[PDB]
Design a protein around this ligand. Structure first.
Ligand SMILES: *[C@@](C)(CO)[C@](*)(O)[C@H](Cc1ccccc1)NC(=O)[C@H](Cc1ccc(OC)cc1)NC(=O)[C@H](C)NC(=O)CN1CCOCC1
Lengths: 233, 248, 204, 213, 239, 231, 238, 196, 201
């Protein structure tokens, strides 16, 4: 038995590396950066037909121009998402402008290693967040996709997959993705890869899709417009 | 530092609090303490553990504590930990009277202390209070009441209950004799002497080995009265005639 | 004057083996009368009473905070409180607010448990004890009450004679004060009984 | 009793054109009936696109410009961008309001270029109230400069004038003329006039002498 | 002052303290609630009340606000804290926003509170799952549940506690528009689900109904025994 | 650089026992014998003061300490621990007097002191006191004798003995003590109870004894102890 | 084995394992090369791709106008230290109106990094830095470690397979001080090149350059800005 | 300036308040309610400072409601008045003193009708009838004149009407409408608003 | 200032001037005294220029967070309560702001008045500012719930004009907003000088 801020002989932190393993348990999520916009996809993994599928939100909006998709321990991300939402509004209040996708990713990444036992505040974290995040939005640099993990490392990705079957999904993305593909091609590609790795058959109420683009704001797909691309197998 | 921490407020692999269950074992070693609800009142009967010839007897009681004008409690477990809780109970009762200008309702006093006992099981890293309490009282909402309290912070209202040594053997004995809505204070007292006679490993039962307190509604005011030796001896001799009634 | 805002008058008197405590019944804000039956004398332990005069809030806040402490005392101790003990408790309570006090000058009247000995005292707003063998007064008509008590009070008075003295002392003093009156309640405390009487008084 | 404030004079002026923004001020620093220094330009440069002018209590003016400098570098590191004219103006509003119950005795005018490349002028009160406008004067002689600008730049009260766009030559002429006129009447204004011109090429500084009495 | 990490990550990426708290709710009394189209009803089984116990004081169904109520499973002492925290929040939402609390909001509060107790120093997770029930000022009925981890979902019908697996799969079969037609039939679905675990209830069944018109109505052992007979002549209608 | 442990060091064993308290009871049992007797006229407190080297100055440190004008103390177990409780009891006695202007009743003082002893069985990063206390006092025209042990529990005695041979002490007491013995006779039987467990022959510099009656609490002078030793 | 849990536990050999393990995190991240001349200080950093469908990690960060850093280790610890360095520089300019001397900033890092290595329940900073700065004493190259020990070096390289760079930097060391800016960067890249397998070397995707000096403030070159520096390349003579 | 009045009978409590919300010289609102529902059988009529009135009365309101949810039953009129008084008394010497003159009316299960008067200094007093505001000075004498403890509710309204008509005749401030409510065993009842 | 708002059959009208004064000196005559919180929520401002601008902007921040957290728009009653609570913490400090918060709810057309003194009242018609006593005059004389959309515009526009004619601290231009079921729209922004010529016919 040890403390939470203990280094392994290799050089990495135990609790942080174990938190990465918690993502492997969570449902798979895909994001694709495109000239025309950014799409975010996630599987819900409904365990019972009695459970309302719309109450499982794994893609949420941070601002009009920024969306976020999580995987792992959903309950942990709720504070991270709220801190992100507060930061974009605080930025607007002070600077009268929208915050950049990279800045919001960076703000959240600062909270990642804010855990500890001794020398800690009355309301301090005890463990890292067991959640990976996919930030997708549009700013001055255009449509951008950012990935985050418990280690606090954040990096821009052309396309990224995180979750249980993230290994097979990423190689599927490397096979399909190239620089010039459209957003319509991006949504189509993300869903095909999603239906391959899912244990359950991909359905309209089974998944979530959201796109942020230069044209208009964050938009989550309804049952009808989900079915519009579900019928393309 | 973390090597010396015994982790008092932690879950077990099976999903239970070890320090609470281990504390409950401490209650089972303490003196037998029971309570019975009647129609015309409510009483507590407790086994005296301070039973030495050289003891002085200065206080009105050993196990029974008066908390309020309308309320009283009895204790089973670590006696020092009880002194902390009984003192806090009196403060809570006074806080309520200061604010609302009427006596604290029985259930409200029990929950307030249980909130404290629960706290010591979830955070702080301290050991739980090794005490189970039985509460008797009257309020303008439910009348005569009897409540039980755990070291876990768990509480329950009972018509008849027992805690301490031979708790299981006593509760099944109460489960036999008790009549719902038919028990009078005289019949509940007779039951109390009977149950304590069987659970007492020294089955002679003198008045100096037991302790009985009654809570009655008397002409608009609540009367809490601890029965003295001559009253208790008289109750035992009544029960002792029932052992001589089996010769039929 | 902050003490003259609600008015009021509280008096205590020593008898043979008894004590009397009286107060006016007016509750008013400055010139306006609001209630004709306000309680200023409070029971602290059967044969012991406290009368509080001053600001109506502080009269009520002190009375309730004193009972809070007294109930805890009488439960911690196996006994009921003694008159001198209450006096020191009140003094303690009032001095805690030394630099921002309750605007009330209390008066304690009662009989000592077991010894049945009479006891009277008055205190400061910051809790200075003053024990006497004759009388203690507090209120807006302090001067009026003193003039009555000095000329009327006699050494050994039986409950009936004591009642007549405190009643007459209160009535005639109150009648020269604008912010006091509207009825006078008197408690005569004996070992075996307590006599409580409201007097026939002016209502102007 | 000790007073934490002192009136140090100084008047700041800014005019926004279509491709330029002029920020100008006198150079006199005063206290009571005496002059501290004849060389104290109130216009200070923040970025390539933005220039600020501060007047009133100099102590607060020095502190605030140092605070802005720090906050500007803070934004640069955090966002990888230079802070824009509108974003500085929005920030300055919050900084001035943070001292609401102990105000900065300060009159700020921000002049620079927006995202489209057009001229911008932002006016400020001591506690943070601000708006964008085409021309603004702030300071001791602000009540002297303003009416002439309202008449000549805004064409207000005039009947049949064409409404010709502001040229750099006319605006520069207008700054010099109002300051010469203010130096005749306001005792706090004088010595020398410094003008800062904001264009696509950057910031230029020009100095013209005034009365020194 | 006591800053010791209680809940930590395991080598395989698990939170044992959370999972152990989820074992504590498993040992608790069976709690089930179904969502109709006019009324929402929840009920609790696995009672085994000693008879000699006052059944009024051991109620596991609690009201939170004028329009929100909840049931639980697991550590009864833990729930009482949560319920009190949820009740305070219901009035605090009225002091800040004036508008009454929504069913989703109060669930989100309970969930965040339970989540905060899995990521804080010196604290241990709550060992309860809650079934939150209410009506929006909109007309639509609502049913939510929480668990020790702090995850919450909306349900048409759900069961947590002892033998939650058994009732969960009974509801999956029996939940149709025919079963939730009127008020009586939605109540029947709860009781029929409770008879899967409990040894013939009526005395061992506590259940309460909530309509959008009136507050909470807890049914007494006389009104519950009526449904015991009404479904009995449905069961004994095979011939 | 310091803070403090916030977790208890006294915990419940699987058998349901507070092990540290029972081990602290072992410490008092191994301590020097002390006896207390209520005389219904006064109270006597007597303790063994074996000095071991003669080089030790007897009068320098005392085992029988006064809390106030009417209350006195003895212990069995650890000297250093006893001394902390002495200071705490004295301070508690003054708190009461400042509020009520009345000498603190023995029962009230014992309750307050026992609460402190209770704290050290539950507070963060501390062990219980390895001391049992004998508290005597005169108030309300009545003698009092109390015992406070490591757990934080108090008992009212007519007569008791603690430390080494506490079993032999009590069995000697109930055999010899009767609730009628005057203070003078109480001192005799207090010394005799110590004599039962002494092994070394008594002198006036070998035992410490304090009395408490209506006149107040005081330690008996070496000369007085010498005159009583003429048994 | 039993002495490797806490920074407060001393090994019987007179070592602290927790500090040594934190130092391993530096050797985990990709190599970065720091070198100085007489007027300029240059940081050349290799970037890691987690999967070449994603961008290469940010390795060079700004501190002030005259100071810049290249990190090796934990990113979140790197940004935490970076914010501390920024703050101290900002305070210096706020108070004294002059840039904070590089040596004095590094001395402050030594102070801040020492604290956790002596407190229980705390951990060392899992990042080593190479600091490039210019002040009154000319260009500077400083090395920091998870242990609060720091170095004032002529040239330095830390990271994965940074051993090969150390050999190159040592042999062409006497050439550095008299060297011009154009070739001073070349020497940096030719050092960073050695820290790579013989398949492929430096490109526009994986090279980041940070230059500060008497001429210019600290500037980061990354993609299109890095391609003039790569031109005039000399193939690997392994 | 605001007005409150309360009349207690044998088994009811009649309360009324003006519906005027004014700022300096203008009447900004015509249908303002100065009555706060605490329980099903308790009303709290709050009057005084611009901000303190709403903030204080509402804080007590949600606390009584919290008590209702906490224990299953409601507070008594006696317990409610003492709870309000405690919160007001405690704040009196603090940094934020509430300047509110209030009037609490309620019906108890066992004790019956109850009316409480309260100072801004937090002086609690039980009265058969009580009034607040400048209008109290003109009306209180009419209450003293035509009041018996055995007054029926229909004649209590007549007595109330005598008071409100006096406010039209002598009182210099314009007070056209009044909110009228009665509390008894059945709860709180809305009455016809008396208008002029 | 002068600001006014009233609700009729077809929605809610919101009118304001644009004068800003610094003592007896006119600082500006182009200030936007109506704050656009949501596509359906508005807020007027009168009093301390900085105080008004800051707290209403703080409220606009607060409401967006509410919108993100609950997936629903905030109610007029809720929005108004938040501002009322925030400003109450600072009562006695010397803040000066009289504001009207108005939009469209599930309850329908809402209109609330909020003070720095701690007032919060719902009403069908309000007038706030130094020239409020003048605006009330004509707004009440020409008001009816049955007013046409263009007739309601004329009532509000003239009510500000009449206020600028009497009050020294009111002037500039009259800005008009119409809050309807779908949301609000910018109606008109006419100069007082231009209106003066039209109202003389
Ligand atoms: C009318 C025009 C005048 O009363 C309005 O109330 C108007 C409202 C408004 C709203 C936003 C933008 C512009 C205008 N108010 C003012 O113009 C206002 C008048 C005022 C001054 C001081 C007050 O006490 C705090 C209250 C009202 N003018 C200002 O606020 C001016 C621009 N600023 C100052 O006076 C400077 N500071 C000095 C420090 O204290 C705060 C004000």
């Amino acid at each position: 038995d040890r403390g939470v801020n203990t280094f392994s002989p290799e050089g990495r932190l135990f609790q942080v590396e174990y938190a990465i393993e918690a993502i492997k348990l969570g449902s798979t999520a895909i994001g694709i950066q495109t000239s025309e916009g950014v799409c975010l996809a996630v599987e819900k993994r409904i365990t019972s037909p009695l459970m309302e599928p719309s109450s499982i939100e794994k893609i949420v909006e941070i601002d009009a121009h920024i969306g976020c998709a999580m995987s792992g321990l959903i309950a942990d991300a709720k504070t991270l998402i709220d801190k992100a939402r507060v930061e974009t509004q605080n930025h607007w209040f002070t600077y009268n402008e929208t915050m950049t996708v990279e800045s919001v990713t960076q703000a959240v990444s600062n909270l990642a290693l804010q855990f500890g036992e001794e020398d800690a505040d009355p309301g301090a974290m005890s463990r890292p967040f067991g959640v990976a995040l996919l930030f997708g939005g549009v700013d001055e640099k255009g449509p951008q996709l950012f990935h985050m993990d418990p280690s606090g490392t954040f990096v821009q990705c052309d396309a990224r997959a995180i979750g249980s079957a993230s290994e097979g999904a990423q190689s599927s993305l490397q096979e399909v993705y190239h620089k010039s593909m459209t957003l319509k091609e991006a949504i189509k590609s993300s869903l095909i890869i999603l239906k391959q790795v899912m244990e359950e058959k991909l359905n309209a109420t089974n998944i979530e899709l959201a796109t942020v683009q230069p044209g208009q704001n964050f938009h989550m797909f309804t049952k009808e417009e989900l079915e519009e691309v579900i019928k393309d197998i | 530092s973390r090597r010396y921490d015994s982790r008092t407020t932690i879950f077990s692999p099976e999903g239970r609090l070890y320090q609470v269950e281990y504390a409950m074992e401490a209650i089972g070693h303490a003196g037998t303490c029971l309570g019975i609800l009647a129609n015309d009142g409510v009483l507590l009967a407790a086994e005296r553990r301070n039973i030495h010839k050289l003891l002085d007897e200065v206080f009105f009681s050993e196990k029974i504590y008066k908390l309020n004008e309308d309320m009283a409690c009895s204790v089973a477990g670590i006696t020092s930990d009880a002194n902390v809780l009984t003192n806090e109970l009196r403060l809570i009762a006074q806080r309520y009277l200061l604010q609302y200008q009427e006596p604290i309702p029985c259930e409200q006093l029990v929950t307030a202390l249980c909130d404290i006992k629960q706290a010591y099981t979830q955070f702080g890293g301290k050991r739980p209070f090794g005490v189970s309490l039985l509460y008797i009282g009257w309020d303008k909402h439910y009348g005569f009441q009897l409540y039980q309290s755990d070291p876990s912070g768990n509480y329950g209202g009972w018509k008849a209950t027992c805690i301490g040594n031979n708790s299981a053997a006593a509760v099944s004995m109460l489960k036999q004799d008790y009549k719902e809505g038919e028990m009078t204070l005289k019949s509940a007292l007779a039951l109390a002497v009977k149950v304590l006679n069987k659970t007492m490993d020294v089955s002679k039962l003198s008045a100096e080995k037991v302790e009985i307190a009654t809570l009655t509604r008397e002409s608009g005011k609540t009367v809490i009265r601890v029965l003295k030796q001559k009253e208790v001896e008289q109750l035992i001799k009544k029960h002792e005639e029932e052992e001589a009634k089996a010769e039929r | 004057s902050i003490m003259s805002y609600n008015g009021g008058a509280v008096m205590a008197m020593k008898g043979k083996n008894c004590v009397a405590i009286a107060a006016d019944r007016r509750f008013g804000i400055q010139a306006q009368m609001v209630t004709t039956d306000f309680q200023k004398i409070f029971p602290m332990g059967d044969r012991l009473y406290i009368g509080l005069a001053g600001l109506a809030t502080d009269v009520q806040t002190v009375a309730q905070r004193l009972k809070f402490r007294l109930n805890l005392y009488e439960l911690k101790e196996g006994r009921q409180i003694k008159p001198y003990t209450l006096m020191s408790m009140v003094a303690n309570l009032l001095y805690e607010k030394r630099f921002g006090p309750y605007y009330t000058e209390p008066v304690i009247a009662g009989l000592d448990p077991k010894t049945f000995k009479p006891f009277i005292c008055s205190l400061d707003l910051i809790g200075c004890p003053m024990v006497t063998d004759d009388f203690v007064v507090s209120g807006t008509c302090s001067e009026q009450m003193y003039g009555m008590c000095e000329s009327l009070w006699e050494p050994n008075m039986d409950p009936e004679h004591l009642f007549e003295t405190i009643s007459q002392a209160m009535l005639n003093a109150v009648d020269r004060d604008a912010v006091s009156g509207m009825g006078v309640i008197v408690h005569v405390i004996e070992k075996d009984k307590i006599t409580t009487r409201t007097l026939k008084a002016r209502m102007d | 009793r000790f007073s934490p404030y002192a009136f140090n004079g100084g008047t700041v002026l800014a005019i926004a054109g279509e491709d330029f923004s002029i920020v100008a001020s006198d150079t006199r620093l005063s206290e009571g009936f005496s002059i501290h220094t004849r060389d104290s330009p109130k216009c200070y440069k923040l970025t390539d696109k933005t220039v600020i002018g501060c007047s009133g209590f100099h102590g607060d003016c020095l502190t605030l410009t140092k605070i802005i400098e720090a906050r500007l570098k803070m934004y640069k590191h955090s966002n990888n961008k230079a802070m824009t004219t509108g974003a500085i103006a929005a920030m300055l509003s919050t900084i001035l309001y943070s001292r609401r119950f102990f105000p900065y005795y300060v009159y700020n005018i921000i002049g620079g270029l927006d995202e489209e490349g057009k001229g911008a002028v932002y006016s400020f009160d001591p506690v943070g109230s601000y708006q964008r406008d085409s021309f603004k004067a702030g300071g001791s002689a602000s009540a002297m400069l303003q009416p002439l600008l309202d008449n000549q730049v805004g064409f207000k009260n005039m009947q049949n004038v064409e409404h010709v766009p502001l040229t750099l030559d006319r605006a520069m002429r207008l700054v010099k003329d109002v300051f010469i006129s203010a130096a005749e009447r306001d005792v706090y204004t004088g010595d020398a006039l410094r003008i800062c011109i904001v264009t696509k090429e950057g910031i230029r500084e020009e100095t013209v002498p005034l009365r020194k009495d | 002052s006591y800053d010791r990490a209680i809940t930590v990550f395991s080598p395989d990426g698990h939170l044992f303290q959370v999972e152990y708290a989820q074992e504590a709710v498993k040992k608790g009394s069976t709690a089930v609630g179904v969502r109709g189209k006019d009324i929402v009803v929840l009920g609790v089984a696995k009672k085994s009340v000693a008879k000699l116990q006052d059944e009024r004081t051991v109620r596991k169904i609690c009201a939170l606000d004028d329009n929100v109520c909840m049931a639980f499973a697991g550590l009864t002492a833990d729930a009482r804290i949560v319920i009190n925290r949820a009740r305070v929040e219901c009035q605090s939402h009225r002091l800040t926003v004036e508008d009454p609390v929504t069913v989703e909001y109060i669930t989100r509060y309970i969930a965040s509170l339970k989540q905060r107790y899995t990521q804080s120093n010196g604290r241990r997770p709550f060992g309860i799952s809650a079934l939150i029930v209410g009506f929006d000022f909109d007309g639509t009925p609502r049913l939510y549940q929480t668990d020790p981890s702090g995850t919450y979902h909306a349900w048409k019908a759900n069961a947590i506690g002892r033998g939650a697996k058994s009732v969960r799969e009974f509801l999956e079969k029996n939940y149709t528009d025919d079963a939730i037609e009127t008020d009586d039939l939605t109540i029947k679905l709860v009781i029929k689900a409770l008879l899967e675990v409990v040894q013939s209830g009526g005395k061992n069944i506590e259940l309460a109904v909530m309509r959008r018109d009136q507050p909470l109505k807890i049914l007494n052992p006389e009104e519950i025994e009526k449904y015991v007979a009404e479904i009995e002549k449905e069961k004994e209608e095979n011939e | 650089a310091k803070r403090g442990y916030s977790f208890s060091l006294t915990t419940f064993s699987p058998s349901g026992k507070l092990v540290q308290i029972e081990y602290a009871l072992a410490a008092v049992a191994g301590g020097a014998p002390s006896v207390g007797i209520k005389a219904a006229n006064g109270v006597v407190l007597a303790t063994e003061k074996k000095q071991k080297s003669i080089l030790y100055d007897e009068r320098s440190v005392h085992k029988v300490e006064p809390i106030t004008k009417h209350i006195g103390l003895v212990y069995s177990g650890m000297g250093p621990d006893y001394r902390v409780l002495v200071h705490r009891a004295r301070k508690l006695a003054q708190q009461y007097y400042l509020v009520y202007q009345e000498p603190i009743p023995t029962a009230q003082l014992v309750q307050r002191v026992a609460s402190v002893m209770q704290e050290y069985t539950q507070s963060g990063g501390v062990r219980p006191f390895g001391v049992s206390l004998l508290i005597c006092g005169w108030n309300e025209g009545r003698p009092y004798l109390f015992q406070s042990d490591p757990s934080g529990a108090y008992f009212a005695w007519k007569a008791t003995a603690m430390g080494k041979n506490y079993v032999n002490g009590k069995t000697f007491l109930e055999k010899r003590y009767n609730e009628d013995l005057e203070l003078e006779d109480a001192i005799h039987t207090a010394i005799l109870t110590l004599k039962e467990s002494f092994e070394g022959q008594m002198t006036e510099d070998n035992i410490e004894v304090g009395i408490c009656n209506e006149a107040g609490f005081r330690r008996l002078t070496p000369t007085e102890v010498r005159d009583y030793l003429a048994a | 084995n039993q002495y490797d849990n806490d920074v407060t536990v001393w090994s019987p050999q007179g070592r602290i394992h927790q500090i040594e393990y934190a130092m391993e995190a530096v050797k985990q991240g990709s190599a970065t090369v720091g070198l100085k001349s007489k007027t300029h200080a240059v940081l050349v950093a290799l970037k890691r791709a987690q999967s070449e469908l994603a961008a290469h990690q940010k390795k060079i960060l700004h501190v002030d106008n005259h100071i810049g850093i290249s990190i090796a280790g934990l990113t979140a610890d790197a940004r935490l230290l970076c914010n501390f360095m920024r703050q101290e520089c900002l305070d210096s300019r706020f108070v004294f109106d002059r840039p904070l001397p590089v040596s004095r900033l590094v001395s402050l890092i030594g102070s801040k990094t020492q604290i956790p290595t002596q407190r229980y329940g705390r951990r060392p900073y899992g990042v080593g830095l190479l600091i490039a700065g210019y002040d009154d004493m000319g260009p500077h190259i400083f090395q920091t470690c998870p242990s609060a020990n720091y170095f004032d070096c002529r040239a330095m390289s830390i990271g994965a397979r940074s051993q090969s760079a150390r050999t190159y930097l040592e042999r062409h060391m006497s050439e550095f001080m008299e060297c011009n800016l154009d070739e001073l960067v070349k020497h940096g890249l030719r050092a960073l090149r050695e820290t790579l397998p013989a398949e492929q070397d430096l490109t526009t995707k994986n090279v980041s350059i940070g230059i500060v000096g008497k001429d210019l403030e600290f500037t980061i070159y990354d993609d299109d800005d890095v391609s003039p520096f790569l031109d005039g390349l000399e193939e690997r003579p392994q | 300036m605001e007005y409150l009045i309360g009349i207690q009978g044998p088994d009811y409590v009649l309360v009324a308040s003006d519906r005027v919300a004014a700022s300096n010289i203008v009447q900004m609102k015509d249908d303002h309610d100065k009555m706060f529902k605490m329980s099903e059988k308790i009303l709290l009529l709050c009057v005084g400072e611009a901000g303190d009135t709403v903030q204080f009365a509402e804080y007590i309101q949600k606390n009584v409601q919290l008590y209702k949810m906490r224990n299953g039953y409601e507070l008594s009129p006696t317990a409610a008045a003492n709870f309000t008084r405690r919160n007001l008394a405690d704040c009196l010497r603090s940094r934020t003193p509430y300047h509110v003159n209030l009037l609490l009316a309620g019906y108890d299960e066992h004790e019956g009708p109850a009316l409480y008067y309260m100072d801004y200094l937090a002086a609690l007093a039980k009265a058969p009838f009580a009034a607040h505001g400048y209008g109290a000075f003109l009306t209180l004498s009419i209450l003293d004149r035509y009041y018996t403890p055995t007054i029926s509710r229909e004649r209590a309204v007549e007595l109330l009407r005598k008071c409100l008509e006096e406010l039209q005749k002598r009182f210099i401030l314009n007070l056209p409408t009044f909110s009228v409510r009665v509390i008894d065993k059945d709860g709180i009842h809305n009455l016809e608003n008396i208008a002029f | 200032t002068t600001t006014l708002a009233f609700k009729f059959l077809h929605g809610v009208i919101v009118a304001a001037d644009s004068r800003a004064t610094a003592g007896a000196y006119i600082a500006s005559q182009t200030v936007k005294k109506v704050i656009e919180i949501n596509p359906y929520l508005l807020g007027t401002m009168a009093g301390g220029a900085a105080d008004c601008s800051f707290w209403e902007r703080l409220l606009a921040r607060q409401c967006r967070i509410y919108e993100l957290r609950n997936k629903e728009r905030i109610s007029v009653a809720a929005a108004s309560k938040l501002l009322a609570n925030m400003v109450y913490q600072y009562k006695g400090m010397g803040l000066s702001m009289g504001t009207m918060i108005c939009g469209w709810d599930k309850r329908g057309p809402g209109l609330y008045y909020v003070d720095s003194e701690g007032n919060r009242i719902s009403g069908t018609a309000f007038s706030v500012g130094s020239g409020s006593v003048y605006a009330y005059g004509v707004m009440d004389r020409g008001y009816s719930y049955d007013l046409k959309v263009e007739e309601a515009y004329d009532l509000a526009r003239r009510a500000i004009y009449q206020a600028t004619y009497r009050d020294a601290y009111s002037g500039g231009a009259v800005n008009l907003y119409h809050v309807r079921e779908d949301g609000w729209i910018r109606v008109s922004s006419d100069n007082v000088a231009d209106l003066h010529d039209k109202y003389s016919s």
